[PDB]
Design a protein around this ligand. Structure first.
Ligand SMILES: [Zn+2]
Ligand SMILES: [Zn+2]
Ligand SMILES: [Zn+2]
Ligand SMILES: [Zn+2]
Ligand SMILES: [Zn+2]
Ligand SMILES: [Zn+2]
Lengths: 431, 431
């Protein structure tokens, strides 16, 4: 009993947009283990419940006092005296404490902080770093440092501009270490600022939620030549690929069954799913686009399947809102061959055990796994250890700008250093 | 010897702009103690040396490999086996290891990471939190949570726009706890986004380096009514004051002896120091401006003195580039009655012992002390403990936005919680 959970305490803290979120400390004899919960803006309809207070007098209703109370008064007292090494057991206990399919009673934001902190307490109990401990939980045979996929032109709900599609990313796929990958990413980002400033002017180089540039662009094609120019100017021709996140659900009108390419503007530009496939095929041909995430609405399984088959072997199709890190949605995606990459978001599902199960299910069926931040992030670095632990080779955790993004990139540097020069880097299919 | 410094290791990590900086780990039997060094953009000419590599092939010359080497090969080996509790002794050793007045041999960025990490190792050795340990080093009689001064409209070298002056801040001076202060700050920030979007459009609400809005404003007066509107709209009329950082050295032309209010634009707007004093007096009258930082060039001691005397008792005048956290410059400022507040930047001077000495010298001569971030920040939270430890009641560490800013605000929440409901909040002169 001396080695068990001694204290569990939740508190409301701010995320990188200044919105409240939940952080949890688990205390054991080995110390205080702290994990914070991120928060999406373009949240899928099938995501586990993010519980907010709705008190118009605090943060216009975005308080997390109820989720914090649920940690302090409900979940915490159940965990005291328990063996933190029993990850599946404690995650299952919290699932049953909640008793609902969507974590709508306690909140996925109450449960996840606990799940995360338990795993860190356990890693400390074993006397191994978090990535090592999580690797054992996941049965991972080979750790690797991931290629970082840097969202450097921000759009959608994340900026700032007319641009309807959410994320335009660069990934140093030909780097041979994480150190080099991160430096190359930063150098291109710096070149990109100069290019954007020259083309669009001073007022164009302020940043979006994920640290990417938020230039005054409307056209979804327009960022792509700019990315290639920055890659070239920084001295890294040939070393980079492009990744997209369309977040296409956010533009979609269910009644009209079409996508609004100008939803942040006074007048609409209605576009069909077929008009989109033509665009995606053109993108994949004109540029080294190796990954397109959420190219269609979150329930367009047929659209997803069509593009997955069309770009088979050239461009992975990533489910994010389609799959919501959830084995049930993933099984539907597998059955329909809807996509071949999982965007893994721990807070889409709400426990470490379930997120791990989702990764394993995806990899067993031949998919890649891209571990992911949310657009509302914290100083928390859990996903850096998690992506190494899963050996997936792919992470997106922001542009190389803003501390809630660079904290993850830096933690990856520290892990790289621990593992030494024989540690694998990158995603083999892209190298 | 079992309790002494066991390992010292430096590494290059990224700051919140994606530029390299230095982080240092000190290892003792009590664990691994990690501190990272921030970096200014509008750096005073009298600041201690930030040592960069100048290798055009890495980060266009901004690498910190040499400072990191100096930690690993020079400073680290000197500290092994030493008693980390001896802060003044170890800081003085590092000063002498460098042997230059500006830390230009080893780098202030090599030395400071060591100074910081030593103090954290020592706090752990004493078994007290960092703020408690630092309070003892400084002889502080009363801890307090500071009023946060939130830079919510970003200008100068930190954005993004025509705006020549650097920082327009809001400070919840009438809050009665840090919790409330931070929530109020965030609520106003949120209201401000809506106001800026309505007045200037979508493209105006992207953020600068410190998480403030970077609207397309040229006129230095123009942000002030917008700040009052946001305060009112958020429901906090009467609770807030304004703080300014003109960073006026950045606009100053030495030969012309005038300030360029449009230095980021094709054509110049030349303005005299007398034209500035009229503006400052008008500001202080029209708005609750309680603090103006660097209203003049970093060597205009006479200008500083004139405005300090004119706003005596109404608006504190803060030396930043004037004083550079440096007892020699501070003595000149005291002699000339040039200012009455110190902006305290640990990396302007480069050791904890010297930064503490600067705080003590300032307070003994009746000045306030505003502990400060740099515009290039990290996930490091040292200044949160430091401002509590000094009991100064004033911090500026960003808008409530971007993780390198919110990490500090959150650490302040944690400290507040530890200290309990009888803990003092705020700056008495403003409450
Ligand atoms: Zn024990
Ligand atoms: Zn989304
Ligand atoms: Zn997505
Ligand atoms: Zn011992
Ligand atoms: Zn400055
Ligand atoms: Zn300043």
């Amino acid at each position: 009993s001396h080695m068990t959970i001694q204290k569990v305490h939740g508190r409301e803290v701010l995320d990188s947009r200044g919105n409240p979120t939940v952080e949890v400390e688990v205390t054991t004899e080995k110390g205080v283990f702290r994990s914070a919960v991120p928060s999406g803006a373009s949240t899928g309809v099938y995501e586990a419940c993010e519980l907010r207070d709705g008190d118009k007098k605090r943060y216009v209703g975005k308080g997390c006092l109820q989720a914090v109370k649920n940690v302090n008064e409900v979940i915490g007292p159940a965990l005291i005296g328990r063996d933190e090494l029993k990850q599946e057991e404690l995650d299952t206990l919290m699932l049953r404490l909640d008793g609902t399919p969507n974590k709508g009673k306690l909140g996925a934001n109450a449960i996840l902080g606990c799940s995360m902190a338990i795993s860190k307490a356990a890693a400390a109990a074993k006397g191994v770093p978090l990535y090592r401990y999580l690797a054992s939980l996941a049965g991972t045979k080979e750790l690797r440092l991931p290629v970082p996929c840097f969202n450097v032109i921000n759009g959608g709900k994340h900026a700032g501009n007319a641009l309807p599609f959410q994320e335009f990313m660069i990934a140093p796929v030909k780097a041979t270490s994480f150190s080099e990958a991160l430096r190359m990413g930063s150098e291109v980002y710096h070149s990109l600022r100069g290019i954007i400033k020259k083309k669009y002017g001073q007022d164009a180089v302020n940043v979006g939620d994920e640290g990417g540039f938020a230039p005054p662009i409307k056209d979804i094609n327009e960022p792509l030549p700019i990315l290639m120019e920055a890659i070239e100017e920084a001295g890294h021709r040939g070393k980079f690929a492009i990744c997209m996140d369309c977040a296409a659900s956010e533009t979609y009108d269910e009644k009209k069954q079409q996508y609004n390419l100008t939803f942040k503007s006074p007048e609409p530009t209605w576009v069909t799913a077929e008009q989109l496939r033509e665009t995606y095929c053109k993108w994949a041909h004109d540029y080294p686009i190796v990954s397109i995430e959420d190219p269609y609405d979150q329930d367009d399984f047929a659209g997803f399947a069509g593009i997955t088959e069309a770009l088979k072997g050239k461009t992975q199709i990533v489910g994010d809102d389609l799959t919501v890190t959830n084995t049930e949605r993933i099984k539907m995606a597998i059955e329909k061959k809807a996509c071949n990459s999982l965007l893994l978001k721990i807070n889409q599902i709400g426990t470490i055990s379930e997120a791990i199960a989702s990764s394993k299910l995806c990899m067993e069926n031949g998919w890649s796994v891209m571990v992911s931040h949310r657009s509302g992030e914290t100083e928390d670095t859990y996903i850096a250890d998690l992506v190494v632990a899963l050996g997936s080779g792919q992470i997106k955790t922001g542009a190389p700008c803003r501390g809630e993004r660079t904290a993850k990139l830096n933690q990856l540097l520290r892990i790289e250093e621990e593992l030494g020069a024989h540690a694998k880097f990158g995603f083999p299919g892209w190298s």
